[PDB]
Each structure stands twice: as structure tokens, then as C-alpha cells.
């Protein structure tokens, strides 16, 4: 006869067809993202629709092979990825109903106008202006406006769409033998079937609470310092014992506090590291800022970049004629073709982001040997974590001294060493409470834990207790403040950022141990340490073939995600924020409210 595991032969047939069709879909997606034309976008949509139909039919075929009779630790994972059968088990005008709901939420988020009472015709979307307003205005009025009015003319109309989205995704997940759509999202972290490595779906919730608990003080001290440095830019608008107004956090939602850097500077007279003014006297072109990134990756052992990467990736900017999406994107087209779509203007940020995208591409080359369905990060937050650890290793002032950007006489005073580390802690920390709170709210809402007539309540309760951010005006249930964020009104799991932060700092700590680093973690670059090359590549070679806990053990050494490397990263500046807040009341009171005055 024939073993039920014959799915092997089925997966061998699927993989060749998947590799060829995905390459066509990605190549069509590539030449559009660099060369937008009507014919290019039509080709991209045609290839994507063909690829999606191919996945649908292969999932229907893979329905025939039960995972119960499969035991190979890799064939079962590919069969699971195929016959996951998500959004196709849902009824015809249900997944489609949601489909239109998803499209409507996407278009309301992308195309949504907000404008002042005085000039009702000068209206701006959160992308143009509104964004800037939150990053530049640094006002309390101009910032309280464009915040409430973003939640009112956009969040209120996103509310019914999200209320139907939650329920429709609920039956979509329950028909997939889940309990809610939060469980469907956590199913990427499911690991069962592996002796020892048995990460369940609810264990993700368990460990995010048990890591946010250790994240609390670092945050509470950072939040207290930011509050103390926001009572001299908004002197009569923030209580020294209360939370932070949500419109004073550098952006629309308070996700990242990186735009509060100018206000909250440890030492404003000491300039931060920025080699943009240094690598224009070296006349670096677009290629070289990548040529010395590849060097970095061949410093640690990661192989060279393929000849089909310099001759096929648009690293010299769109070119002022064709239209080209400029998001720094590493692209794994298919059969051995790795490119980066990145519009590189000479700038330190572009240098670090080039290192980021090359880390992404190196990871793609590493797990290219795996079967197609196992060609991805072992979970949500490994690929991005690799990218950011490459960025961190590139951004260290010691790395920019073998490279002739900084003169061979520089020495960051603890001053800029706290300046840079707080600049990083406004991005890293400040989004961990935001990410954890938002995804925890979504997780409860999906299981209905949060009654609809209480959604906003719980939202703005959590913001007061978890993030320590008070709403500037009371939001009744007509609002959908979470949906005002991109990842909420676009069906994107958001815990990937929290897990990715934990993973990236574990990766950095482990690679610095492998590199025999001696000083602080933030001063550590992995460069020239081939032993830290064959310590992450042992995980990079593993895609979804092995459980993400096993991959973490391979690279870090711990079975489950840990926050201690993140805290060890910020132990300096943790001592400094403990010293600075000796007078400031560390923490916040959830009772405080701007309107409560």
C-alpha cells in the first residue's frame, strides 16, 4: 500500500510548485514595488491571485493527510501550514463579509481626514501632517487636537467595523478548532508535538505577563523620567504623580517614545552619534553603505551576498523616474534570489537600516535550504529580531571606529552613553507596555472577556494601569481607539513586536557572550567574531523546521523567552533613572485625569 505519510511525496510535489509560483508572485511583487505602473500592479495582482488559488487548492489536497499518522517533525509542520484552512472554512458571505470589513478598515485608516475648526478645508490624514504634528508640534493644544479628532472622525467609524470584525474572526478561528481569534494569533507560537519543547498557546499569555512584570520598573522609572521632563515642556499640564497624557508621547498612540527624545534628553549639550555629517566627507555612494554591511556579515562568518543581489536589488534609490515603494524591504524572491528594496539616502539611519535589511536577507539565505513552507522565522519575532540585532551591532560607536566614520580619537562620555541609551529606551521601552497592553486587550476582547459596551472602558483602564497613559478626554463606547493604530485595523498580530524585542535582546546578549564581550551590552558589536557567526547561524539555518523554543535554545540557550537580557541592556540608564527620579514619584496613579481637574 502506501503510508499516510505519503504526504511526503505530496509535499515534494507541492514544494516545487510552491517554489516556482511563489517566485512568480514575488518577482511580480518586486518589479511593482520598484517600478509602479498600471501593468506592473496588474501583473502583481494576477500573480498573487494565482498563488493564493494555488495555496487554496493545495490546502484542499492536504486535507487528505491527517497529522495524527504523520511523524517526521518536519512533514507534519508543512502539512499543518497547508491544511491550516484559515478564512476558507468560514462561510461564503462571512469571510467575504469580513473581507469587505477588512478592506473598509484599511481604507478608513489609510484614507482618513482630520482638520481644524477654523479651516474645515485644510484636512490632513495621519500619514501627512497629523503624523508630523505628533512628532514636531510638541504642543498640548495642537496635540490634544489631531488626537481626539483622530479618534473621533476615524475611530468612531472604525468602531462598528471592528465590532463585526471581532465576532467574524471569532467564528473563523473557532471553525479552525481554536477558541478565539486571539488563540489563532497565538497559534504561531504553538510548539506541541516536540518533546520538551511544548509551548502552548496560552503559555504565550502566561509568559508575556511574567516578562512584563520584570519590564515594569525599568519602564516605571523611564515613565517617571519622561513625566519629569514633560513638566518643563508642558509645565501646567501634567501632574507629577499621575499618568502621561496620550497626546504627549511623540506620536498618535504612544507606541514609540522616540519622538520625545528632544524633550527628554539626559544631557542636551552633548550631541548624539550621527555619522551622516561624517560619511559625506568620505563620499560614500549607495553601494558602499551596503558593501561595508556585507563586510560586517562576512566578518562574522555569514557568507557573501550573491552576485544576483548586487545586480538585481535597487540599492541606488528608485532613480527619480519610475515609482518605487521606498520601505527598506528584504526580499526572498524564491529560488536563490535575495534582494533588498531600500531607497538609501546617505544617513546614519540608512546605514543601520541597511544592516537591518542585510540581516533579514542573511537569515533568508540561511533558511533557504529548508522546505518552502518552513522558509520563515521559527515564530513571529525571530526574523525582525535578527534584523534589529544587526542594527544594534552596527550602531555601536566602537563599530564605527574600524570603519573610518568617527575619528580614531572618539570616546562617548557616559553622557552620550546615557543619551544614546535613553534614545534607544524610548523606542524599545514605551512600546513594550504599549504592545503588551494592546495585544492583551485584543486577546481578552476576542474571548469576549471584554464586553463590547465595556471595550473602551477596559482599554482606557489598561492604559492607566499597564502603560501609565491617561486619556486626555473620556472615551465612551463610540470610540475604537485601538483600531486607530495600523496593526489593529489591518488584522496584524501585534505581540510579535513584544516577543521580537525580547528575542532581539536575548540574541544580542548571547552573541556578545559568544564574542567574548567585556563591557556593557549596549557597547557590544558582534563584528569580527566568527564564533558569534556560528552561534546565530545555528538558528538562522533553522526556519520553521524546528520549534521556535528549540531555535532560541540553539542561539540563546534558554527554552523560553527571557527579559533579563533586555534589562541587562538597560542596567546602565537604569541606575541613572533611579538616580534621576530620587525626587520624582516613580510610578503613576490611574485615578489622575487631565479632564478631572
Amino acid at each position: 500500500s502506501t503510508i499516510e505519510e505519503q504526504a511526503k511525496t505530496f509535499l515534494d510535489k507541492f514544494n516545487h510548485e510552491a517554489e516556482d509560483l511563489f517566485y512568480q508572485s514575488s518577482l511580480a511583487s518586486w518589479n511593482y514595488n520598484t517600478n509602479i505602473t498600471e501593468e506592473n500592479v496588474q501583473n502583481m495582482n494576477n500573480a498573487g491571485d494565482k498563488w493564493s488559488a494555488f495555496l487554496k487548492e493545495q490546502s484542499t489536497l492536504a486535507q487528505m493527510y491527517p497529522l495524527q499518522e504523520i511523524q517526521n517533525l518536519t512533514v507534519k509542520l508543512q502539512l499543518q501550514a497547508l491544511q491550516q484552512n484559515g478564512s476558507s472554512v468560514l462561510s461564503e458571505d462571512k469571510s467575504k463579509r469580513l473581507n469587505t470589513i477588512l478592506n473598509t478598515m484599511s481604507t478608513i485608516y489609510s484614507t482618513g481626514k482630520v482638520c481644524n475648526p477654523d479651516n474645515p478645508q485644510e484636512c490632513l490624514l495621519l500619514e501627512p501632517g497629523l503624523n508630523e504634528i505628533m512628532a514636531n508640534s510638541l504642543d498640548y493644544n495642537e496635540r490634544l487636537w489631531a488626537w481626539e479628532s483622530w479618534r473621533s472622525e476615524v475611530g468612531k467609524q472604525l468602531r462598528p467595523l471592528y465590532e463585526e470584525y471581532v465576532v467574524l474572526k471569532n467564528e473563523m478561528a473557532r471553525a479552525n478548532h481554536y477558541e478565539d481569534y486571539g488563540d489563532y494569533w497565538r497559534g504561531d507560537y504553538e510548539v506541541n508535538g516536540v518533546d520538551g519543547y511544548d509551548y502552548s498557546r496560552g503559555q504565550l499569555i502566561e509568559d508575556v505577563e511574567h516578562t512584563f512584570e520584570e519590564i515594569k520598573p525599568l519602564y516605571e522609572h523611564l515613565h517617571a523620567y519622561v513625566r519629569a521632563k514633560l513638566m518643563n515642556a508642558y509645565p501646567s499640564y501634567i501632574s507629577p504623580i499621575g499618568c502621561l497624557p496620550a497626546h504627549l508621547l511623540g506620536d498618535m498612540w504612544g507606541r514609540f517614545w522616540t519622538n520625545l527624545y528632544s524633550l527628554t534628553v539626559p544631557f542636551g549639550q552633548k550631541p548624539n552619534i550621527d555619522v551622516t555629517d561624517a560619511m559625506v566627507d568620505q563620499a560614500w555612494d549607495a553601494q558602499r553603505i551596503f558593501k561595508e554591511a556585507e563586510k560586517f556579515f562576512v566578518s562574522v562568518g555569514l557568507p557573501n551576498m550573491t552576485q544576483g543581489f548586487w545586480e538585481n536589488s535597487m540599492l541606488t534609490d528608485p532613480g527619480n523616474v519610475q515609482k518605487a515603494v521606498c520601505h527598506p524591504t528584504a526580499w526572498d524572491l524564491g529560488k536563490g534570489d535575495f534582494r533588498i528594496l531600500m531607497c538609501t539616502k546617505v544617513t546614519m539611519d540608512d546605514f543601520l537600516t541597511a544592516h537591518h535589511e542585510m540581516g533579514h536577507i542573511q537569515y533568508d539565505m540561511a533558511y533557504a535550504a529548508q522546505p518552502f513552507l518552513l522558509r520563515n522565522g521559527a515564530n513571529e519575532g525571530f526574523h525582525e529580531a535578527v534584523g534589529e540585532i544587526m542594527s544594534l551591532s552596527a550602531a555601536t560607536p566602537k563599530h564605527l571606529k574600524s570603519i573610518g566614520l568617527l575619528s580614531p580619537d572618539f570616546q562617548e562620555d557616559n553622557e552620550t552613553e546615557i543619551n544614546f541609551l535613553l534614545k534607544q529606551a524610548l523606542t524599545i521601552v514605551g512600546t513594550l507596555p504599549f504592545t503588551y497592553m494592546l495585544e492583551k486587550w485584543r486577546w481578552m476582547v476576542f474571548k469576549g472577556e471584554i464586553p463590547k459596551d465595556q471595550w473602551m472602558k477596559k482599554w482606557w483602564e489598561m492604559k492607566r494601569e499597564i502603560v501609565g497613559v491617561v486619556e486626555p478626554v473620556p472615551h465612551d463606547e463610540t470610540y475604537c481607539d485601538p483600531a486607530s493604530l495600523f496593526h489593529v485595523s489591518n488584522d496584524y498580530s501585534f505581540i510579535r513586536y513584544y516577543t521580537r524585542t525580547l528575542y532581539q535582546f536575548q540574541f544580542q546578549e548571547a552573541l556578545c557572550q559568544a564574542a567574548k564581550h567585556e563591557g556593557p551590552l549596549h557597547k557590544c558589536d558582534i563584528s569580527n567574531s566568527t564564533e558569534a557567526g556560528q552561534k546565530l547561524f545555528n538558528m538562522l539555518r533553522l526556519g520553521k523546521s524546528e520549534p521556535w523554543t528549540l531555535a532560541l535554545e540553539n542561539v540563546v540557550g534558554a527554552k523560553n523567552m527571557n527579559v533579563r537580557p533586555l534589562l541587562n541592556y538597560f542596567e546602565p540608564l537604569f541606575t541613572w533613572l533611579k538616580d534621576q527620579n530620587k525626587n520624582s514619584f516613580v510610578g503613576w496613579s490611574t485615578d489622575w485625569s487631565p479632564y478631572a481637574d
Partner: protein, 182 residues
């Protein structure tokens, strides 16, 4: 003594239906192969690359086909795969050479070179120097069939060569040679 040609044969056979051409007694001046192209792989197992000219044999075959770069190594004594298990098996006592060179343009198209086929599925592994031109549907399962759609599958599989692919994915022309003595 055909070597100025067997190698530069357009439309090389595909690997499942590899083309064998016999080399009779002639001038035997195949030392000129070193001056054709920068071969990706030139592996002489039973004979030495420096001993090609002086050593003499009786009969020679020029087995030619096209594979990927991740599959050139599979053309070796042993070294299991799909190119060795089901398409082109080399005997463990192989005495000839292995000559593979890239042809990512000579044999690639931007829309797809769905012309070079390799057999991914087969009942038994190929014996050394065996050809399996037969293209009857594979069972890949146990309910005997009549057409594809169930576990039954088409034995052959295209390559999908792009004018652009990873080196190990790029097309590679391999005019292997077969020495034998009577």
C-alpha cells in the same frame, strides 16, 4: 572524437531523458575541453585531469543534460538525490569525468524555461546508467488510478529556469563522459 560539439549542443536534453552520444576511436584530442568555458565543476574520478591525454580507452559516451546548481554535486558515485535517485545514477565504480558549467542565459527565460524536465517521483531508484524515458503517471499512493488529482502524480517535473535564479538554481549543462573497455 566529438567534444567541440556535444558540449555546445543547444537544447541539451533534460536530465530525465538525458542524451547519450558514443565517441568512437578518433584523434582523441579532448584536452581542448579545458579551453571551452570556465567549468563550474570538473571532477575526474576514475581518471586524473592531468592524465587525460596520455591515457587511452576503448569506448566513450557523452551523457548530456541540464540540472540546477544545487544538483551538480548529485552527479557523482553515490550521493543520493533526485538527479541521482530517479534521473541520472552514476555507478560507484565510475571511471569518467563530470563536467558541469553554468548556462543561466543559454538556458533561461524571463517568463520561465518550462522546457527542462526532471523526474521527482519514481517507484524504484535508478540503477547505474539507466534511462527512464517512460512518463506514465506515478501512483504516489495506493488507490490505483487513471489521472492526476489524487495521490497519483505526474512523474516528471519542470525546472522553471529564470534568466535569473540562485547559482544553485541556475541552469547547468553537464556533458558527463563514460569510459568503458571491452
Amino acid at each position: 572524437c566529438p567534444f567541440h560539439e556535444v558540449f555546445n549542443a543547444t537544447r541539451f536534453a533534460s536530465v530525465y531523458a538525458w542524451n547519450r552520444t558514443r565517441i568512437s576511436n578518433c584523434v582523441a584530442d579532448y584536452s581542448v575541453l579545458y579551453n571551452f568555458a570556465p567549468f563550474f565543476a570538473f571532477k575526474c574520478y576514475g581518471v586524473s585531469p592531468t592524465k587525460l591525454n596520455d591515457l587511452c580507452f576503448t569506448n566513450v559516451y557523452a551523457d548530456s543534460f541540464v540540472i540546477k546548481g544545487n544538483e551538480v554535486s548529485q552527479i557523482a558515485p553515490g550521493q543520493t538525490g533526485n538527479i541521482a535517485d530517479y534521473n541520472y545514477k552514476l555507478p560507484d565504480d565510475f571511471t569518467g569525468c563530470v563536467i558541469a558549467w553554468n548556462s543561466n542565459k543559454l538556458d533561461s527565460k524571463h517568463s520561465g524555461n518550462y522546457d527542462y524536465w526532471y523526474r521527482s517521483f519514481r517507484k524504484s531508484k535508478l540503477k547505474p546508467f539507466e534511462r527512464d524515458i517512460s512518463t506514465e503517471i506515478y501512483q504516489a499512493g495506493n488507490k490505483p488510478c487513471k489521472g492526476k488529482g489524487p495521490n497519483c502524480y505526474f512523474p516528471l517535473q519542470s525546472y522553471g529556469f529564470r534568466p535569473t535564479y540562485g547559482v544553485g538554481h541556475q541552469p547547468y549543462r553537464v556533458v558527463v563522459l563514460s569510459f568503458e573497455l571491452l
